[PDB]
Design a protein around this ligand. Structure first.
Ligand SMILES: CC(=O)N[C@@H]1[C@@H](O)[C@H](O[C@@H]2O[C@H](CO)[C@@H](O[C@@H]3O[C@H](CO)[C@@H](O[C@@H]4O[C@H](CO)[C@@H](O[C@@H]5O[C@H](CO)[C@@H](O[C@@H]6O[C@H](CO)[C@@H](O)[C@H](O)[C@H]6NC(C)=O)[C@H](O)[C@H]5NC(C)=O)[C@H](O)[C@H]4NC(C)=O)[C@H](O)[C@H]3NC(C)=O)[C@H](O)[C@H]2NC(C)=O)[C@@H](CO)O[C@H]1O
Ligand SMILES: CCCCCCCCOCCOCCOCCOCCO
Ligand SMILES: CCCCCCCCOCCOCCOCCOCCO
Ligand SMILES: CCCCCCCCOCCOCCOCCOCCO
Ligand SMILES: CCCCCCCCOCCOCCOCCOCCO
Ligand SMILES: CCCCCCCCOCCOCCOCCOCCO
Ligand SMILES: CCCCCCCCOCCOCCOCCOCCO
Ligand SMILES: CCCCCCCCOCCOCCOCCOCCO
Ligand SMILES: CCCCCCCCOCCOCCOCCOCCO
Ligand SMILES: CCCCCCCCOCCOCCOCCOCCO
Ligand SMILES: CCCCCCCCOCCOCCOCCOCCO
Ligand SMILES: CCCCCCCCOCCOCCOCCOCCO
Ligand SMILES: CC(=O)N[C@@H]1[C@@H](O)[C@H](O)[C@@H](CO)O[C@H]1O
Ligand code: NA
Ligand code: NA
Ligand code: NA
Ligand code: NA
Ligand code: NA
Ligand code: NA
Ligand code: NA
Ligand code: NA
Ligand code: NA
Lengths: 331, 331, 331
């Protein structure tokens, strides 16, 4: 089966980086084309009861700040087996359990710069979409309790340049108009800044959907990191969103923040990030969506890693505001 | 909808660069596989009356002088809305209205080395296929008159590395068996040779299809560039083709040429290019063609950019002849 | 037609390079998703008797030791013509007649490290999947005898950086339950290690399918290399496999070896490779197979090339064992 998301975003960015020329280069209008084509199917094997499943999904065809063209396999790509009894098992390239919650609901709308790949902690706070991953998704036990669990090789292990690995787990419990989310990811043998690291991330969160038309989500994220030289790092973060849904319209206010990193008990000042985001969406069709969105990103103004060199963050390119109109179509 | 063009061209090139080894490297037989796979669709949104259109076309799967493999998104790839009243508007990666005229009819067959990317002027005479583009295509007003107009980001801006931008427009008016074409493209903030350029390119041409089997096109192209140091460059070009189509055969002669480049009033000697080209083509099927082609490219023998380093042109690799056969099958 | 091979291999590798960090980096578990998508078709042109055939195949979407994402055209991608009388001709990216036999049957299960790209000989023992190739595949004469023939441009010529080319031919004759195989490849103008090489490579082999469930294959390969500074190099190599097939199961033992390389008449000590492999496979469906596989690779411990630098071989990373299970599903 061939499927696709046609996603296009006309976004103007106004940067305040400290450098005028950097401002000009990074800012401006671009067309963020995140369309992707994918292939998926199921197969009932004669001599095996669990149904075989596989998916190959291509990447963004023409993103902003990037070249044209994407290959098949850049997004969620896997084989696996499923049965109503014990759920779904996927082998390959999937989202970690932690990341799936960080992305949804917490990174919408345009909260990702802060809540998704933002942060200042060393090592690996978590993977996002990872290859070399075994992920078990349980069924909806009693229609309320579900579990995601996964393990996989790290980024350098994926290329034969390392021994990094990671495990993760998330749970969800539905309680009427409420859902309680709890996730964890541990990362190990992460080689960065002349050190080996271990990372532990925990996430708690609630989302609510009321027949009154108001929906909301709130997430708390706690990030710990330990370097082989003895340094310990801590940073926490939050994300919250408020939605009002009337017919063919939806209103959304989002906010997310990274708080000052702490290193060996001392707080590194000016290492926090915050983003405020507003969006109106119009359900133009059962299968598609239009949207306008405006967001303000205020990132940290910089910090050094354990190798006494600047550590990269979603704030190195500097603070920016974004106005965008988008469309999104599913088939 | 899956679609494709299957294009294979077996081409032998004989170079005369002045260097025996370079002649040997660049020349010889190759297979130019410009086959490509596309996806496109329309969708009629319930709550929006203009038809939604989208397309994602892959790149040449295995071209001459290149590696194997093409991602999805490399050729025309866009989303838009179409309504018979006011035409179609596309956002994404399309051809600029200029380039579409310099490509067809004026770069066929094999004229493109001189008339497409050829030429000695600095800055950017025009974009070809460009990402981050809004393009309006008018209807054929009264079945005779059409306008193509577009603005977009530059090559550096698309990467966050510049502030270049451009707009263009082209007009066509069908007068019985003839079509008049005019177009323009301006590029701004182009960073090259250590200067900031503005380009302006002007194109006029004519195209004819008569009932006696004779067909033709001629175009005149005028290219001006202005550098921030006040340097002014000026270069013009022509391209013309004669075709005789009889039954299942089509004979074609093409000629294109760039004339000596003028910088600050002075003609730069020996900066011209010309290509003459013959082609026989067989309509093997309603969906496919076969063709042989021979062409002779005589390029300029070099010039210096505003940085006092040699400026790269389609002639840098050297004069060459080319004998090719190919097949093209649309599905 | 859309088609596909879904292929996933969970592989555990234990290396012994003599550096425990390299052993940790290279070793460990990976998921080797060699899944690919492809498009192929035929078309009877109205004015041409041979059937037009074409195919574009994508690459491994997420292989082990590599990154995610494959483009279209990475695997067999060609146009051509077939007729019952004289066979089929293909232009594009296909397998070399030699390499086809080297891959099947002689590289399975897991013998390719030694027998496919393994070996110590200079130049290019043979191409494998080569672009810029034209390949004739004969009909199966009298349902018994078949010929493959190809010529093609070399890797550097395909980028206009060289003049390497190659030719090859392969014969197959069915004798009762046996298949007899012979094949040859010549490569010319191969620029490596500061020299220009000519490679000649010869191959003979037999395959048997018996009615008691046993089948086997055995192949002998002889590779010769001649450098422009007058060095001559020879190496030979073998590969065999035993199989027993009952109901829905197949057992398989495989062995392959590269023998010591001889250079300028003097054999170079300790340049031989060895692989033993066992495999169990379960025909989990007419469309798919499960398999577990264990194999042991003992590679050469070093040789120098003609540029006084270590010559890369499949042994450079070091000796290693591999335990794996996989699934393969064709649609
Ligand atoms: C049912 C359900 O679950 N959901 C329903 C859903 O269908 C609907 O709502 C939609 O939800 C989906 C998710 O469910 C949303 O999809 C997400 O959308 C966002 C964007 O909209 C995607 O975000 C991208 O994520 C990747 C991370 O992997 C980002 O990658 C980063 O990109 C930046 C680019 O600037 C990189 O920066 C560069 O970095 C290099 C590296 O060092 C540096 O050198 C450079 O300086 C730097 N360059 C520049 C120019 O800055 C950065 O490194 C990189 N980071 C990483 C780790 O790769 C990518 O940029 C993100 N893109 C944007 C834009 O933010 C997200 O991945 C995607 N996920 C999924 C799973 O879909 C969707 O947005 C949402 N739609 C709408 C309209 O709201 C709704 C109904 O529609 O129903 C739900 O129920
Ligand atoms: C050049 C001003 C553009 C505004 C974007 C800046 C966003 C962060 O600034 C926060 C400071 O107040
Ligand atoms: C430093 C060791 C931490 C190990 C964490 C154990 C698993 C925690 O799961 C909690 C789910 O929330
Ligand atoms: C369960 C707590 C959710 C509320 C957190 C809001 C934090 C506000 O921080 C100040 C942000 O700056 C002004 C923008 O206003 C916030 C709008 O976001 C609404 C959050 O739902
Ligand atoms: C219906 C007959 C139309 C013939 C048009 C001929 C015009 C050619 O000259 C164009 C010059 O500008
Ligand atoms: C400096 C040489 C003059 C350039 C010749 C122009 C011929 C183009 O005419 C095409 C008609 O439109
Ligand atoms: C015309 C002097 C020799 C320079 C070689 C350029 C050949 C192309 O020029 C065609 C006419 O202008
Ligand atoms: C070493 C090659 C031997 C080839 C066997 C020839 C058998 C031909 O006749 C078989 C029946 O047809
Ligand atoms: C299976 C056919 C084998 C024929 C050998 C080809 C001869 C090439 O040798 C030329 C070396 O000089
Ligand atoms: C056609 C089957 C040939 C059998 C292959 C065995 C090759 C072993 O030779 C090693 C030479 O040293
Ligand atoms: C129909 C059963 C025939 C089995 C005979 C196999 C003989 C294998 O020897 C091949 C040597 O080359
Ligand atoms: C030093 C050479 C020893 C390896 C020879 C292996 C022979 C295998 O032949 C199997 C039957 O064909
Ligand atoms: C044979 C051939 O086409 N060569 C050129 C190459 O020299 C050039 O660098 C590239 C784009 O700059 O376009 C191509
Ligand atoms: Na990762
Ligand atoms: Na800031
Ligand atoms: Na190529
Ligand atoms: Na461009
Ligand atoms: Na810009
Ligand atoms: Na010349
Ligand atoms: Na090759
Ligand atoms: Na060559
Ligand atoms: Na060894």
């Amino acid at each position: 089966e061939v499927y696709g998301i046609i996603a296009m975003q006309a976004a103007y960015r106004d940067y305040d980086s400290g450098d005028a020329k950097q401002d000009d280069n990074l800012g401006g209008m671009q067309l963020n084309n995140e369309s992707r084509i994918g292939f998926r199917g199921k197969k009932q094997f004669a001599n095996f009861e669990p149904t075989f499943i596989w998916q190959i999904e291509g990447g963004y065809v023409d993103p902003s700040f990037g070249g044209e063209g994407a290959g098949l396999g850049e997004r969620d790509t896997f084989v696996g087996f499923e049965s109503a009894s014990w759920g779904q098992v996927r082998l390959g390239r999937v989202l970690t359990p932690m990341y799936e919650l960080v992305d949804w609901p917490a990174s919408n709308p345009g909260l990702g710069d802060v809540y998704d790949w933002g942060g200042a902690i060393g090592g690996a706070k978590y993977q996002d979409r990872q290859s070399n991953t075994i992920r078990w998704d349980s069924p909806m036990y009693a229609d309320k309790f579900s579990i995601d669990a996964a393990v996989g090789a790290g980024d350098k292990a994926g290329l034969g340049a390392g021994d990094d690995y990671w495990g993760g787990i998330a749970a969800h419990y539905k309680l009427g108009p409420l859902q309680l989310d709890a996730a964890y990811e541990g990362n190990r043998n992460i080689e960065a800044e002349g050190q080996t690291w271990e990372n532990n991330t925990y996430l708690v969160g609630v989302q609510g959907w009321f027949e009154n038309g108001i929906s909301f989500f709130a997430q708390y994220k706690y990030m710990e990191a330990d370097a082989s030289n003895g340094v310990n790092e801590k940073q926490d973060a939050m994300s919250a969103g408020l939605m009002y849904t009337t017919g063919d319209w939806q209103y959304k206010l989002g906010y997310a923040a990274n708080f000052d990193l702490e290193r060996d008990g001392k707080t590194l000042s000016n290492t926090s990030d915050d983003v405020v985001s507003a969006q109106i969406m119009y359900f133009v069709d059962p299968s598609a969506v239009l949207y306008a969105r405006a967001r303000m990103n205020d990132f940290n103004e910089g910090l050094d890693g354990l190798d006494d060199a600047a550590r990269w963050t979603s704030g190195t390119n500097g603070d920016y505001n974004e106005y965008s109109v988008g469309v999104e179509y599913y088939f």
